[model samples]
Target: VKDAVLKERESYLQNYFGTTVNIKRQKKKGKIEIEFFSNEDLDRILELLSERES
Candidate 1:
């Protein structure tokens, strides 16, 4: 994926949650990953996913 769309999602994850994020790809697999070490951080992402659309 292009870096423009990459950071768009990267910053979205961070800006929405104010959490530190890491993004990378391997072998053109387009693997997208986000890391959160804190419990609160995990919950927010989970909640963000589990919550219904606004």
Candidate 2:
């Protein structure tokens, strides 16, 4: 469930699609712990996923 767990909550920037990211990690100790650069990185991840889904 690591893959599913990792892509739970994320987002991506419109301008920085393949350039930068806006990550948003959930700091709940044993709740969520995914690798990311910054809050913006998380956004990028989620955004990209959503784009694919759409």
Candidate 3:
């Protein structure tokens, strides 16, 4: 993932939801992972980011 895109999304998620969004960089393949503690929060994010897309 692009560094700027990852950071931008991380900031947006935190600002919008007021939750701790953890971003971890994978050492093996330079991929980024987003961690949401609760499945409910994940669902909310999925719905907001994807389901409501125009």
Candidate 4:
């Protein structure tokens, strides 16, 4: 992911939710993983980032 995009996520999590959350991007042999412990749903998070780059 680009720095701009990463920074945007940090901003959104901190400002919108007023908390520090962890964003993880991990991949294995046959599956993709990108998760955040936040108020947004899986689909919502994907739509928010709109990259599917995770």
Candidate 5:
């Protein structure tokens, strides 16, 4: 994923969780690595992206 995508969702996630969000992306093995601060954040992100999952 690109930073723009994260930026777009930043507000929504922060607003929903009522906490500041810090997203980090790492380039590894030819894929984007997006890491969340906690499992709750990761779970929410995965849930949000479930419909787009292959």
Candidate 6:
């Protein structure tokens, strides 16, 4: 189930940072964790924030 769990979120981050990610799920059963080593991605995340999905 980790694949589905991860995919649900990482797809967005992977695109933002222009690379794959390292992630772990924890935080009082309310959140998970992932990390990307860049600031550009933070800005690049703008790519999808516009919400043109179908």
TM-score for each of the candidates? 0.60, 0.31, 0.45, 0.34, 0.43, 0.33
lDDT of 3 by residue, 17-37 (tens): 557765665653554344577
Model 5 compared with the native: what TM-score? 0.43
User: After best superposition, candidate 2 residue 6: deviation in angstroms?
Assistant: 16
Off by over 4 Å in 5: 28-54
Error of 2 at 15 (Å): 17
Clashes per candidate (backbone, < 3 Å): 0, 19, 0, 0, 0, 0
Q: Per-residue alpha-carbon lDDT of model 4 for 1-54, expressed as tens digits?
A: 455576567666666534454544444223223455764655566675586555
Task: Give candidate 4's root-mean-square deviation (CA, Å).
Answer: 7.4
* Candidates' C-alpha lDDT: 0.73, 0.48, 0.68, 0.53, 0.63, 0.57
lDDT of 2 by residue, 1-54 (tens): 353454433233334344433344445343422345677877866676578766
Using TM-score as the measure, what is the rank order of every candidate, best first? Answer: 1, 3, 5, 4, 6, 2
lDDT of 1 by residue, 1-54 (tens): 467777778888887778776677655666555567788888878888788555
Best by lDDT: 1
Clashes of 5: 0
lDDT of 5 at 36: 67
lDDT tens digits, residue span 20-44, model 5: 7655655623433345678987887
- Tens-place lDDT digits, model 6, residues 1-54: 455666667787766557775455555244433344576754555544655563
Model 6: residue 3 alpha-carbon error in angstroms: 9.2
**Candidate ordering by lDDT (highest first):** 1, 3, 5, 6, 4, 2
